[PDB]
Amino acid sequence: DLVQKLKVLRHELSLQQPQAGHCRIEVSREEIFEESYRQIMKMRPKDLKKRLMVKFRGEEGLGVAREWLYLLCHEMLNPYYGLFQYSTDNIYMLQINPDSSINPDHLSYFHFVGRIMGLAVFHGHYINGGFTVPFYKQLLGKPIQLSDLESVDPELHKSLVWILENDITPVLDHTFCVEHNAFGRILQHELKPNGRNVPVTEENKKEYVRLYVNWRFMRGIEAQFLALQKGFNELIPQHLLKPFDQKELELIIGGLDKIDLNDWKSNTRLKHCVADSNIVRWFWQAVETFDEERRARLLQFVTGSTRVPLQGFKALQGSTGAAGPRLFTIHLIDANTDNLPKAHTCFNRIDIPPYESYEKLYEKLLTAVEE
Secondary structure, eight states, X not given: OHHHHXXXXXXXXXXXXXXXXXXXXXXXXXXXXXXXXXXXXXXOHHHHTSEEEEEETTXXXXXXXXXXXXXXXXXXXXXXXXXXXXOSSOTTSEEEOTTXXXXXXXXXXXXXXXXXXXXXXHTTOOOXXXXXXXXXXXXXXXXXXXXXXXXXXXXXXHHHHHHHHSOOXXXXXXXXXXXXXXXXXXXXXXXXXXXXXXXXXXXXXXXXXXXXXXXXXXXXXXXXXXXXXXXXXXXXXXXXXXXXXXXXXXXXXXXXXXXXXXXXXXXXXXXXXXXXXXHHHHHHHHXXXXXXXXXXXXXXXXXXXXXXXXXXXXXXXXXOSSSSOOOEEEEEOOSOTTSOOEEEGGGTEEEEOOOSSHHHHHHHHHHHHHO
């Protein structure tokens, strides 16, 4: 199982975390994207491996990287910024935008997104944002298969399938060079060192084919991916990803994308109330009533993030923030019943007033989650 292989990866990463010092990030909520960019990019990789201390500017009086990561991923992964775009054929998943060159500094922003992804995995946190299958395969360092290219370029796929099941000796005159229309002009690109003078033979056509497929998936997003990858590997070394596949990397990076209710209830603690308190009974009744989306907004309202750890609700306050696992807490406060439930994201605690009815609790709970 994944938690087993992950604990080996987390232990190797934990050895790289200097027990002395804190990685200090203080950004505003209204400028979280550009302020986090400036602060993270000013640091050296060694500085990012120190235990995280994220504070929102001003809000430190009356801090969590869980909420900061959530709000930061929400911003950087939005197509408004031109780094990522939704896929045409996977309208539910992000991919690198090939027209990212519009921003001349795009390569530094991709390197920053990579730093944020590595920082999240390194500190036991997750990234809210789903990527495509070739994104995870590329990030992992493993080669894309020829069958994955049929959907992307069926004419090139047809040609490369011909090469593999035919004797190219009396027919082909290819080199490890691909000539393509680069917007307005044809450009020769070598697939390997000195590819223009390396002919494709029966002895090396398998290598030529896998390099051509790899090159075609990187078309337009080469500089972008390289930048992201260098930021990600500054926290998560490439060798430590070796025991994982595309689906396992997607889970390591983003956590579970389904909230189990029984695990949420098993890892819930109560302050100022007991299991048979009306507020507790009513809260869980309102929670079964909520849809998968309303449940995720409730998790974000209380814990600061929509992300569920791969170990479940038991490991809620990630690897760093204060001491350890600060479990989801229901706190019955004595306060005016016209108030909305308060949330202390730093403790995964919801302060619920002593409502007089289930419907009263429901409407105030729903109203708090939409805000």
